[PDB]
Structure formats: structure tokens, C-alpha cells
Write a protein that binds this ligand. Structure first.
Ligand SMILES: [Mn+2]
Ligand SMILES: [Mn+2]
Ligand SMILES: [Mn+2]
Ligand SMILES: [Mn+2]
Lengths: 140, 140
């Protein structure tokens, strides 16, 4: 599920940055109703991605951690990608949040190589940028 | 609406390639129930994107034609893009069909410049490909 991936990716980030995370952290983070969060967490608990105890709070199972880290890698690769090709900083999160779920892993890998391509030599970055310049010259 | 864009893009292609197009052409093309197609066409008629008459069949209004052509440009740019970075031919349509709706126009433009970048010089294409080679060498 697409919103599943959002939850897993989000819970992953919440645990990582806060250590302790709850249903409230997810709600706030996703701007969703906590009751809806609970229902989701329960399905996730059922599919054995996580564990939601008292003193424990949310804890990702070994399986949740592999997937979660994969989703986090994917999300950040997409941001870097869009940033690299010149998308306006303000547009990135939104676009990345939508497409991340409709890209195959085979594509995610090709996007990875593509980022490497530009990352290993600025000459390439300047040639790409110069295309954007001429493309938008009628507005400068 | 995302499925709206699919319909408009599809009706556009159907008119272009067949001249005459009906509700049945859409159903078949989108693998959707025709009754559902009718309901959609009626909303589209209401928002003045198209005209659905007897001898006329489906006809895009001047407005439907600008948007439709824009959606068709977008869809094909995405295919070319993925193909250009090495995504397996079999994966392209699916990935393109999902992401096309969650990319801003600002991104679609940067994707355009990026395609130009590689299209104007094969040297660039060979350097990108060589990255994919080394990336997958453990499987050759
Ligand atoms: Mn994400
Ligand atoms: Mn998302
Ligand atoms: Mn399409
Ligand atoms: Mn689509």
C-alpha cells in the first residue's frame, strides 16, 4: 500500500531522530487523525513490520527496518535527483512524496546511477544548467 | 483528477489515431467498464473538455485539445526519460502511467532539459551507460 510505505518510512524517521516515538508523533508528522494512525499501526503490527508496546513505544521489527530504510533511501534519492536537475526547492517534497510510490526498483536504480553521473563531475552539472538557462532566457 | 488526465490523454490519442472515437474505444483502451466511461465522459462534457454527439462521436473542445496535447507531451517525455536512463523497456509504461500525475510542470520542464542534455551528445549517454555497467558488473 502507498500510505503503508508513508507510515513505515515515517515511523523509521521518527525512531531514528527521536529514539522514542508514538502514535501522536505519526499523526502530527503526517497531519492525520490519530485514530486513523492507530488502525494503521495495528495492521502494520499484524503484518509484523513493527511493535507498539507501553514503555517501548513504536519499534520496527527486523523486517520493518529493512523496508523502512529502503523507503528512506528512495525518498532521499528522489529529492537529490530533482534538486540536481533544477526543480525549484519549493516543489521537491510534494513531487517526491507522490512519485516515490509509482517508480519500480529498476527505475530507482537507474535514477541512482544518473545521480552518480552528475555527482562525480561538475562539468556535467554546468552543461545541464546551461540548458536550463537558455530554456528560460526569455524570462531573464 | 488523476483519472481525468488519463481520460483526456487517452481520448486525445484515440481521436488522433482513429479520427472517430467512442465510449467503447475508451473502455477497451483503459480496460474499464463502459458505463463508468459514460459517467466520466459526461463530467468531461460538463467541464467543457469534450463533445459527445451522434455522428460526431467524441470531439475535444479547444480547451480539451490544449490539455490533452499537454498530457500526451508529458507522457511521452517521461517514457523517453526512463528509456534514456536505462530503465528496462518492460517497466516504462507502468512507471510512467503512475508518476505522470504527481510531477509538477516545473519538474516536467527540468526533465525536458535533462532529456535534451543527453540527446544533444552521445558522449554523455556512454558515460551514463558505463555507470550502469559497473553498477551491474556483479551480475555479468
Ligand atoms: Mn516519502
Ligand atoms: Mn508518499
Ligand atoms: Mn499517460
Ligand atoms: Mn496515468
Amino acid at each position: 500500500t502507498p500510505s503503508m510505505e508513508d507510515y513505515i518510512e515515517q515511523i523509521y524517521m521518527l525512531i531514528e531522530e527521536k529514539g522514542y516515538a508514538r502514535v501522536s508523533d505519526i499523526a502530527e508528522a503526517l497531519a492525520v487523525h490519530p485514530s486513523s494512525v492507530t488502525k494503521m499501526v495495528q495492521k502494520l503490527d499484524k503484518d509484523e513490520y513493527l511493535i507498539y508496546e507501553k514503555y517501548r513505544g513504536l519499534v520496527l521489527t527486523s523486517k520493518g527496518k529493512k523496508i523502512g530504510k529502503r523507503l528512506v533511501y528512495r525518498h532521499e534519492l528522489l529529492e537529490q535527483f530533482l534538486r540536481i536537475i533544477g526543480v525549484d526547492e519549493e516543489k521537491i517534497y510534494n513531487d517526491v512524496e507522490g512519485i516515490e510510490h509509482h517508480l519500480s526498483w529498476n527505475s530507482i536504480d537507474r535514477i541512482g546511477d544518473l545521480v552518480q553521473y552528475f555527482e562525480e563531475d561538475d562539468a556535467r552539472k554546468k552543461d545541464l544548467k546551461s540548458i536550463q538557462k537558455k530554456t528560460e532566457h526569455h524570462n531573464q
